[PDB]
Design a protein around this nucleic acid. Structure first.
Length: 90
RNA sequence: GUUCGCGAACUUCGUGGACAUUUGGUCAAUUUGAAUACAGAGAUCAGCAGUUCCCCUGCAUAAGGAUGAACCGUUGUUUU
């Protein structure tokens, strides 16, 4: 519920998502749910070989388990609030 | 006395003017114990940068504005 909240707080965000099977895709995050899935608007290029065989796909739904990271910058994410939340929880 | 003019028989008589003078004119230079010299030793043409003041142009520093750029940021067996 902490992490879900955090994800929600990142609504409307151009972020790169590296998947398990060598798939790195950029996109503007829209919807966030209990199991941490990502629907990204406007799919753009990150790398040439790793980026998968898509083109006209402008909207996607990433399965939450298959993500390795969610590549944020240092100007795109919460931190000591998260820490506080963690502390509060057991 | 010395010249120029005119009257009478170049020559001479009768005659009217004019007749000072010197200072102010030393080549220097060198060889002398008068000779050599011989007037005395860079020119002209043309660039460029400098200096000052201005104007433009580009950069730098100071300051001081104006404005842009998407989008949210931080304190009982499949997604654990």
């Amino acid at each position: 519920m902490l992490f879900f909240s955090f994800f929600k707080t990142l609504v409307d965000q151009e972020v790169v998502v590296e998947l398990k099977n060598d798939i790195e895709i950029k996109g503007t995050l829209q919807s966030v749910d209990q199991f941490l899935n990502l629907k990204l608007d406007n799919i753009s290029c990150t790398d040439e070989k790793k980026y998968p065989h898509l083109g006209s796909v402008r909207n996607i739904f990433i399965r939450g388990s298959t993500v390795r990271y969610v590549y944020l910058n240092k100007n795109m994410v919460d931190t000591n609030l998260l820490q506080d939340a963690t502390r509060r929880e057991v």
